[PDB]
Write a protein that binds this ligand. Structure first.
Ligand code: OAA
Ligand code: OAA
Lengths: 380, 380
């Protein structure tokens, strides 16, 4: 129990216990019973959900998916195994992984019309716009299984999203440059096949560099879930209205499209580019991922920053992931798209969770009204 | 002041005062200082923003835009005057309205390529999908003024949205049926011109019914803002990341696409349709808008429900708006689109507000972790 005393006064609140981390003080019917609200910029101290998907403690600093630490999955799992784990909450036995992997492998081709629909975008349009556009359009082609309540339908569009979203991001890249779209090769991994779709020409056969593959696969594990989140709390809110799966991911994708969140990688490069386009090099808590990322960065290795890094190791992140992506040949305007591809499983897991609850109710936040109280006067 | 006492105990919280309605108890750095969070399903009792845009008291029951009651604007204003008011926070003098009205009237045509892009959707696709798809695509054609920080750019895409979104919704309708798209007539009102775009053929000239016009214009005033909201808190969250204006509206549009929120009108008709497709008529707080809406409904007047209405006036809303829209010839799958057209000014006003603040910070909600704590075992 807690007790709260407000000018009207005064109230007792249940405490809800967390299997790890901070516990919650359950607001009741806070107004009334009390005619008062909490005010909390950013929702930074408010929790509206229970989930058992990702635990983090930065101070500690821990990141686990379903209890498993990130260093272990990064080093020992795969992006697909991680998709499975996050979504259904356990690691898969050999049959379960293969059948899940099989199910995704057979849904990677888009409807030819949805392929053609890329034709309407302008001559070399930025991929981030194209991808949000195309994801909303999915409901136009896969009307088939859109019922948020029916599962099996959720299952089929969970599959469709995990399979088709890399295909879409690879096509948006091809569109952003002049290049033909390729098709899925059944003989590749999803991640390896994603890399062909992105980088393959019809002028030659494509061989994925294995070091490249493992680097990308790992990096999607590192970015698979991180919640709660701007992006995912957005998937949660839209789903709140019982929006369908696609429409909720799209909202996650739109939230992701902003520099503070999804394009932080892109901001860093932008920092870098300027310098190379101006006179140079002058003056005026550890993440478990960060450390794994520096490691894979130092191997694979930007033209150039490294000075920057060395330079202020002397005198006084998202930074490393940017360099890597660029190192693998990804142009800066694919970074946020790469982010969504990796986060997709988390977006999905949270939405599914949200659905499986005792019953969710729609999101209805408050405000502190700070305006007027007046009468209409005719326009003269 | 308030004081909160928790098992660790115990803390004092500032109170932030509202010019009307409930006041807030400002969470501080709630964890730590305390290692605890609030838990509040739906955010129902939590406020993360101050705004002075819409005040409501349902119990009372009041709805005002910028201090002005809804009955007065509905009966005496226009949808455009209401757009202006909400966004810039005051009613406009004769020059300001005309110049604002002029500015919108000259931006209603889409880029011909963005027009053509409707060609890629399937043969008679539902409008709601098409509209989310096309709104995300705006950033592809109006790269021109996308800087969330630069105003004047915000101004130009505020205009572009208010002008072009009815055009887009009218085209999505035309697409949903077989029909040619028409173009804007400079000699019409936005709302009247919207109705031509929706219902006009090239086989005859279009005359808008004035009773029809006034009915639609009023109805967008009734739906112009209502916040805070699922839909608008979603626009607020996306904007939180500094997403651009279009990407934030798109998120509002996706949140709107769900039965609890934007498609409540559509749910009612769906209730109605079933009956007409099964054996019939059997058994097992006042909104200020509601009342205005019944009034305009009874004049303009569904095949049929009215029995339903009479029938349980005997024995024991969003309902009335559905009948009207259908009465004006709108098919059920335009209802949520009609909803967005009306809400657009509110979406925009809140986003702009959010921007003009001392400085917003990104949305970072919490959770109550309720999961595991385990170690990777190889897949056998
Ligand atoms: O994963 C990242 O790069 C950061 C992130 O999503 C978050 O704070 O949610
Ligand atoms: O306006 C409506 O029809 C209901 C609504 O948006 C809300 O509760 O925010």
């Amino acid at each position: 129990t807690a007790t709260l005393r407000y000018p009207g006064g005064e109230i007792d609140l249940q405490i809800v216990h967390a299997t790890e981390g901070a516990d919650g003080i359950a607001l009741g019917p806070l107004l009334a019973k009390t005619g008062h609200t909490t005010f909390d910029v950013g929702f930074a101290n408010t929790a509206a959900a229970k989930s058992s998907i990702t635990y983090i403690d930065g101070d500690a600093g821990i990141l686990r998916y379903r209890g498993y630490p990130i260093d272990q999955l990064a080093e020992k799992s795969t992006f697909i195994e991680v998709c499975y784990l996050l979504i259904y909450g356990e690691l898969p036995d050999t049959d379960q992984l293969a059948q899940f992997t099989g199910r995704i492998q057979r849904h990677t081709m888009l409807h030819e019309d949805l392929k053609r629909f890329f034709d309407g975008f302008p001559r070399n349009a930025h991929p981030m716009p194209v991808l949000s556009s195309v994801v909303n359009a999915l409901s136009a082609y896969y009307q088939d299984a859109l019922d948020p309540m029916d599962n099996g339908q959720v299952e089929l569009s969970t599959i469709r999203l995990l399979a088709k979203l890399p295909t879409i991001a690879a096509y948006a890249y091809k569109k952003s440059v002049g290049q033909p779209f390729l098709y899925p090769d059944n003989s590749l991994t999803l991640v390896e096949n994603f890399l062909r779709l992105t980088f393959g020409f019809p002028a030659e056969p494509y061989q994925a560099d294995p070091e490249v593959v493992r680097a990308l696969d790992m990096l999607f594990i590192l970015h698979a879930d991180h919640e709660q989140n701007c992006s995912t709390s957005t998937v949660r809110l839209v789903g709140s209205s019982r929006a369908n799966l696609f429409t909720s991911i799209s909202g996650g994708i739109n939230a992701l499209w902003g520099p503070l969140h999804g394009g932080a990688n892109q901001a860093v490069l932008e920092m870098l580019e300027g310098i190379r386009d101006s006179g140079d090099d002058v003056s005026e808590n550890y993440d478990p991922r960060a450390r794994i990322v520096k490691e894979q960065a130092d191997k694979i290795l930007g033209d150039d920053s490294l000075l920057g890094i060395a330079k202020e190791l002397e005198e006084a992140v998202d930074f490393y992931t940017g360099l890597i992506y660029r190192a693998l040949g990804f142009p800066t305007r694919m970074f946020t798209v790469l982010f969504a591809l990796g986060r997709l499983p988390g977006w999905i897991a949270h939405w599914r969770e949200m659905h499986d609850e005792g019953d969710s109710k729609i999101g209805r936040p408050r405000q502190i009204y700070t305006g007027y109280t007046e009468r209409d006067y005719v326009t003269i």
